């Protein structure tokens, strides 16, 4: 309504019309995920939508931390504290909703002991170590990654550390729908997906699912 909004595949325009469900990421660190924006997508998931959850970083967001010059300790500090601070924003809204936070909220690392995540996640890390195409691809989103949280070096060794991030947000991006289940869901972000391009072109040996899009919004 106040967003414009682009599509993956033609099949995510087919997904988006039906309406039946969203997944707003909302990112650590960036300038972009501010409480007014938050407020923004939540607000805008609800009005068009049968449903909609909030994907939030996973505890793999201290890797990219690590990466740019943060003791282990001081990562896991910093990355519990913005987590906290957007899930107290996240709630809020789905409050003035009128909708119940209980199952609404999850962060990548929620579904670590998942029968569903678990299977998914394994053929994505294969892919890394046998696919090199892959690795690169992944190397270069985390390479993205650090770039985007540069708020306060680099090397290969660096963007291997930072992928576990990226390995471990895939699982969301191919087929969210057995893990968090929904019969067909969009993963919505503000910015395009180059993996996920590559990934619709048959590049690698991985597919998006049939029941499971990626949207681009952008404001109007």
């Not at 650590?28 to 939508?49: G, L, V």
């Not at 990562?75 to 199952?103: H, L, P, Y």
């Not at 890390?125 to 540069?150: E, H, I, W, Y």
Request: include cysteine; aromatic fraction near 12%; hydrophobic fraction near 35%.
């Amino acid at each position: 309504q106040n967003f414009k909004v682009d599509f993956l595949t033609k099949n995510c325009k087919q997904i988006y019309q039906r309406k039946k469900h969203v997944i707003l990421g909302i990112s650590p660190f960036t300038s972009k995920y501010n409480e007014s924006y938050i407020r923004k997508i939540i607000q805008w998931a609800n009005s068009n939508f049968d449903d909609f959850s909030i994907l939030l970083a996973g505890e793999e967001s201290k890797n990219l931390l690590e990466c740019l010059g943060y003791s282990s300790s001081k990562a896991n500090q910093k990355v519990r504290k913005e987590i906290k601070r957007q899930i107290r924003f996240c709630e809020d809204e789905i409050i003035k909703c009128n909708k119940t936070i209980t199952n609404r909220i999850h962060r990548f690392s929620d579904f670590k002991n998942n029968i569903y995540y678990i299977d998914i996640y394994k053929t994505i890390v294969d892919q890394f170590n046998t696919d090199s195409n892959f690795k690169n691809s992944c190397l270069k989103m985390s390479l993205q990654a650090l770039q985007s949280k540069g708020k306060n070096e680099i090397t290969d060794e660096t963007l291997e550390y930072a992928a576990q991030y990226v390995l471990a947000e895939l699982p969301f991006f191919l087929n969210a729908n057995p893990i968090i289940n929904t019969q067909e869901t969009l993963m919505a972000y503000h910015a395009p997906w180059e993996l996920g391009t590559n990934i619709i072109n048959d590049q690698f040996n991985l597919k998006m699912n049939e029941k499971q899009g990626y949207i681009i919004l952008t404001e109007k």
